Amino acid sequence: EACQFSHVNSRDQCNDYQHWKDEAGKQCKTKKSKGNKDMIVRSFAVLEPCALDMFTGVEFVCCPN
Structure with a gap:
């Protein structure tokens, strides 16, 4: 129901901020x-x-909005 949290981080997952x-x-x-x-x-x-x-991983929150 409420907002959910999801992140993506691996050893090779190395990309730029914008990416x-x-x-x-x-x-x-x-x-x-x-x-x-x-x-x-x-x-x-x-x-x-x-x-x-670059960052090996990134965290981001999701919402049902």
Whole structure:
């Protein structure tokens, strides 16, 4: 019912801030609730650090808005 939390972080998953912003967006959009519903992305911020301008993983929140 309420908003849900979802993150993506792996050893190879190393992408730029902007790149993640888009990916995290698709991860939530493509994802759905038990009732095959839809959910947007309420919050978003990178997690683990990667190369100069990259992150090994990213965390983002989803909402049924």
